[PDB]
Amino acid sequence: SHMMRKRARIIYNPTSGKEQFKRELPDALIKLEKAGYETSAYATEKIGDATLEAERAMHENYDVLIAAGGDGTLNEVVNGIAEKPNRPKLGVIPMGTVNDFGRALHIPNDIMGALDVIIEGHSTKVDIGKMNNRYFINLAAGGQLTQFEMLPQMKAVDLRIEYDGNVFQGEALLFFLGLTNSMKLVPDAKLDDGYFTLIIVEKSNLAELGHIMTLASRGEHTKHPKVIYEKAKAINISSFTDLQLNVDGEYGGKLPANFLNLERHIDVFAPNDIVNEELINNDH
Q: Which residues make up the binding site for ATP?
């Protein structure tokens, strides 16, 4: 008995990925209890349930919030706790078909392995993004479908993007704001630095398109002059024409959008076993 008793809340999507978690919950509870966590669980039913539960949990003095599901459950949990005093630490159990945030932090795709990471108690702080009044953890993207794989479907649109002091103003096929980058690359992106990865693909002819696509195919897109790469903390986006917004893999409304990177905002259990190339701070 090496620690004083703690309180954990599991927030889980029962129909997530392979859907094995609900069946494995009783053993997850045993393991968490043996490690000293009085553990309770909440099963989501619809989109938004995880956010609302995380909001309630804020008032219930938990040491850890465990999100068991895909990037959607994760995004929802973060939305419920972001910018609130006394945030619990976040535990990630990757129960989605894709788990881009998990892979970004090297969380095992094995339940008991992910639980081993939480129980061991080493954690990192990662940036999150604020967009208008909501939050995100992976990426935001924007463009207009005609009348990187999707670039040939984009229509040039006039846009302005104020990023920190600077201004881009012109026609663009696509913009990306990346936090994590394993959904894929810029060469030197950090989860830690307080900077979004900002990609803007400018309006280009068919040849520049072919070219950008063949460079993309071997991690060299950033080398094309029509591909802009900047790092920025605050990015404000507007146009007079209407754009669709993708936020963490889902439709996230439309413009205008104001983005702020909340540097090292969220404390999340991570492996002390392995070195993260995308972290400035590996003090864990």
A: 13-17, 44, 70-76, 97
